[PDB]
Amino acid sequence: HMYDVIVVGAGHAGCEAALAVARGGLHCLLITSDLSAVARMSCNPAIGGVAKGQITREIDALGGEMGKAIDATGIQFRMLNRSKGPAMHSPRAQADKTQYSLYMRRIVEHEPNIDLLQDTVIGVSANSGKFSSVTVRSGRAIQAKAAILACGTFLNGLIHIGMDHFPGGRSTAEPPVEGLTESLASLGFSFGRLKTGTPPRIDSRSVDYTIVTEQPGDVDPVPFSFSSTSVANRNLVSCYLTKTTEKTHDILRTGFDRSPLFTGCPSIEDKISRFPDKSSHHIFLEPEGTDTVEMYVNGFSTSLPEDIQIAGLRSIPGLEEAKMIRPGYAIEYDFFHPWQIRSTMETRPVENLFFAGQINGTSGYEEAAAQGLMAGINAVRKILGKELIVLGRDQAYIGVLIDDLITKETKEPYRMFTSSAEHRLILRHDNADLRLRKIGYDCNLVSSDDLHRTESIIKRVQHCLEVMKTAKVTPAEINTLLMNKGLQELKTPARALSLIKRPGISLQDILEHSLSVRSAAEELCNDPRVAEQVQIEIKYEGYIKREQLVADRIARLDSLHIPDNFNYDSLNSLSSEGREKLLKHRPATIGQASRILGVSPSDVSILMIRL
Amino acid sequence: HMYDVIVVGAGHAGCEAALAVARGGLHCLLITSDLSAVARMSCNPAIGGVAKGQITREIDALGGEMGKAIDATGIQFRMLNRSKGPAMHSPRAQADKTQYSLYMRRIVEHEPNIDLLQDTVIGVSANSGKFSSVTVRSGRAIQAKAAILACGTFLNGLIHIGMDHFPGGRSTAEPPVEGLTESLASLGFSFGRLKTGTPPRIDSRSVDYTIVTEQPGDVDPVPFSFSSTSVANRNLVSCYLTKTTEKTHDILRTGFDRSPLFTGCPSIEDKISRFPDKSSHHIFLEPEGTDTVEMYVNGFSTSLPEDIQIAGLRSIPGLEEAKMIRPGYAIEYDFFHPWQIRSTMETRPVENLFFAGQINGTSGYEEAAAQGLMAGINAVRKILGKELIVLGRDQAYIGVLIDDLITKETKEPYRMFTSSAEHRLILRHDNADLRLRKIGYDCNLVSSDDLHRTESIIKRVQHCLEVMKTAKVTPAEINTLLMNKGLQELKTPARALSLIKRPGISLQDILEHSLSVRSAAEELCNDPRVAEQVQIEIKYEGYIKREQLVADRIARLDSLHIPDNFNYDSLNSLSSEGREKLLKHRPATIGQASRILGVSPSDVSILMIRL
Ligand SMILES: Cc1cc2nc3c(=O)[nH]c(=O)nc-3n(C[C@H](O)[C@H](O)[C@H](O)COP(=O)(O)OP(=O)(O)OC[C@H]3O[C@@H](n4cnc5c(N)ncnc54)[C@H](O)[C@@H]3O)c2cc1C
Ligand SMILES: Cc1cc2nc3c(=O)[nH]c(=O)nc-3n(C[C@H](O)[C@H](O)[C@H](O)COP(=O)(O)OP(=O)(O)OC[C@H]3O[C@@H](n4cnc5c(N)ncnc54)[C@H](O)[C@@H]3O)c2cc1C
């Protein structure tokens, strides 16, 4: 009798993986090179942002830790894109790097099913194309039914500061892993190399708080976790805004031809290069903890020579006397081409071997965590012999991410920010639980008191929308309100509640003004979530139906997975630039085929009147 | 304008060093390879013990952090040698390893004079035999007036598990430093190599809490820091006692010839080898935190092959199903021969360069911390041009340690436990503040409210001892007490308080029983400290005078630093051996000369009728 799943690496993918395997009721072994460093935040002292916020909430909705961890460890909470719509609202908080990592370990150590081991994996062994065991530095083999690899930037890592380069997996402070990459190539795996940068850290006390403008967390912040109740008290530090000078840019041009991130997006070098017309660039100074002196210089990711970096930083207003604790650097690492893995996070070359995280050439904690979660769930499912889970592009940002990963192949690590997923309103942060909670249940990650509670919150919204049409509102109550708001004047018999609250009126502006409505529905009053959902469902009726119709169109397309071993030289009126892109790329699903820039909308129509 | 003191390495020596330099009002630069790891407790999850407790309190008394840190971070407090006397009482507490480290960083970061840098030093540059600068990995030179080196086990470190060996400075998880040792040898420094072991860590949950006997922290524990007020609430975890079997020893004999710690004291291998007559050995299972699952297996330091270790551990009762998170290993490292440094912690080969910690071939946090403190103080003094501080063997355990270090030259790292410092009662833990507090003041480390407070506590003790000869106690009050204690029966007029409290009666047993005494002195009541001091001063009158008389002979002979420039060839009635040990060792003080095992009591007498 041995282990079920052994998860290598206890970073962001590794944790969500090991936690999912354990909470899924299977014996799990977490192997990692350094326990002092579980879930360490190597780069940004923050979680969330444009696409990252949504994907974090979706991790929470499925029963993952990252959501809870940031609510537990936040330093300033700030929602991005406030003036924009529900689809644009993006949750983001600063983390206490060290306190975040401690929390994540604490959780992993309190889960009975996870045994821990501090060693480095230098090889994975496999018999006739299916996983068997894993070789640690000592040369032991450790036997398991299925293994998740979550190695981040450690596989033959190299640190680049200007022209010199040192061994190092995350920072110079970490030894790189050396055995494993050759061992995997030995099992028929192709691999490339990626570079990603981190900005320098500076001593807070060396900053001129007379010039730099302070940016506090917003009054009444938003919790990532649907289980959390408040994060009001978690507004402990604020961040600090500045911009760069034309004079900063001159200093940095010096080192361009030395920095191994300069290209032809991940640089300040690259930024000034691709945009020499903007005479300014934003930088955010972010404390890394509530009482550390270490400060992260956002938007200044760099590989310039150590001496040029300080010269640049000091030119930035507010940082004339900046003391630099670490230089910014780039990490070069081995990654495994994302076509080699399935949508299910399982690998093609070997069954029961899953890849999650930076190792798939993605970048981001949230991005890595989401993969770890799925890879974890699916490792349990495989051992049980149950159905593996793939999320749809109409279901989650995670679905879009994992699909885009295995599909879109490019020389740069995949970030979700440039990902302008046209499915926006239906995938907004605030309904993630409704969408994914049931899927969470099937994987033993969401409690019944949770699952059943989300099943009832949807019942109330639609039950309320019943009343929002019947309910009537006389021009006696709202006319004086509308006079001041300068909105639509109610000359007449407008009731049809929905027809009122659309152009710029709150749902609560009505319940407050008519006895009619609150009598028919005061349940939304008592619950603030229903109130929030209903108010959007009707204020965005038009656009939701429009988006959902396309999502179903795209759902139907992604639901024809049978195009494989058939003559691409059978189709009648195709090609001339299509057909050649089809034979080159070889699309798995016909939905995947409609995103190749070579094929036309008219070409995929002739592939449908076929399959 | 540059830096004053740059301290390399932020371990135990490094911190006390950097903190002493800063609190001493000088600009300081702490350079260390990894900030995530300041003051990390690489080995034992505890502070104090036999000699180590006293030396911690003495660090506190001088204005160091280690005392405060363990009061802040203790998990179980336990005084060792309870049944023995005041000289034997030794304070010791378990630390939350991770929480201890965090505290120590927090303090260093809140000291304005310390700037921080994360880099590795690969060289120290010097002009005409005096310190000038320090070369970091990038090849920058960083200029300073004086530099403390506190590198611990990192200088060309090598990890030994049985027969295979990996690079690594503290654990496998750390890169070793490579440039510096050759650069120092280049400046005329000899260096050797030492090996020290750490025991394996095990998962708490894999322990059989039916067999293992629990050892709670003692009711009413003792604070290390004289500034702390209680540590009562800091009894959060307890430790777990077991012993080894004859069967454990058989399993371990297998790997003896592989383990590079086996010799001919630092091993379980060595222990069973040197003592095969004892059919049992003690092991202490110590949690490393209040809520970590990681557990330290004290008394099982080992270098045996990874597979033999687990086989051994499982044979120990209570650990039949033990899951091992890490193997025990040995660390081999470069150290600099302690004769090359002065008593003042400054080096002979180069002025303004100080050596502190494991780099002087000592072992222990406290041992390292104490050196750091002194090295720090003396770096400030040198730059100011003030008197350097050397502590005497009658003043502190730190004085004994530093003297023994530069004097006693042996193939093994120096530990204070085997150090049976005959000066015991005068150096007990509980008066450390009185002895050293004034010395602390001169170095800007002890506040006036502190210094003046210790100057007044001594006033009360002697002021009380005035009254303890005068005050009277009738046989009416104590006779019933003495009847139960079965002590001396008071037939008659015994007053003379002192004459009462001697054979087995508390000072507080009297104040409680006679109206006479508390009326004449209730000040000792209010200062439970005065009460504690007085009670010993009189219960140990005989032995204190006896010890102090010998200490005064060693006092005089300490400060006979005159024989600087003369040959041992012009000295008459000396040798055989005696003259050859003198030319070899080359003693600084003639007191130091009388402790060399080669020279006789009659030989030093002919060195005195001379100087
Ligand atoms: C330019 C740039 C921009 C970025 N922007 C963002 C951003 O906007 N938002 C954001 O959240 N993040 C951002 N990051 C991303 C972040 O740096 C990485 O994505 C993250 O460090 C990788 O996560 P991971 O879980 O996949 O692996 P890691 O967290 O790096 O995990 C590696 C862990 O596995 C262990 N390990 C590795 N290999 C082995 C082995 N073989 N044997 C045993 N143990 C092993 C190690 O101990 C380590 O702890 C950015 C990074 C860059 C470079
Ligand atoms: C067998 C054994 C028994 C022990 N028993 C005890 C005991 O009973 N009680 C006890 O308290 N302890 C015990 N220990 C002792 C303990 O393991 C060491 O003494 C301690 O780790 C060394 O302390 P230090 O301050 O000198 O250096 P360290 O704490 O090891 O400091 C090294 C630090 O300096 C930095 N650094 C090093 N070199 C450089 C460089 N060149 N450039 C930049 N930064 C650098 C690193 O980042 C690191 O954090 C024991 C150890 C062994 C092996």
From Swiss-Prot, chains A, B:
Q: Which residues take part in binding FAD?
A: G9, A10, G11, H12, A13, G14, V121, Q358
**Which BP terms in the Gene Ontology apply to this protein?**
tRNA methylation; tRNA wobble uridine modification
Family matches, as Pfam families: GIDA (PF01134), GIDA_C_1st (PF21680), SAM_GIDA_C (PF13932)
Q: Which cofactor does it need?
A: FAD
Give the signal peptide as a residue range, or say none if absent: none
Recorded GO molecular functions are: flavin adenine dinucleotide binding
Q: Which amino acid positions bind NAD(+), per UniProt?
A: C265, P266, S267, I268, E269, D270, K271, I272, S273, R274, F275
Keywords carried by this UniProt record: Cytoplasm, FAD, Flavoprotein, NAD, tRNA processing
Free-text function comment from the UniProt entry: NAD-binding protein involved in the addition of a carboxymethylaminomethyl (cmnm) group at the wobble position (U34) of certain tRNAs, forming tRNA-cmnm(5)s(2)U34.
**Matches recorded under NCBIfam families:** mnmG_gidA
* Protein name, entry field: tRNA uridine 5-carboxymethylaminomethyl modification enzyme MnmG
As recorded in Swiss-Prot or TrEMBL, the protein's gene is named: mnmG
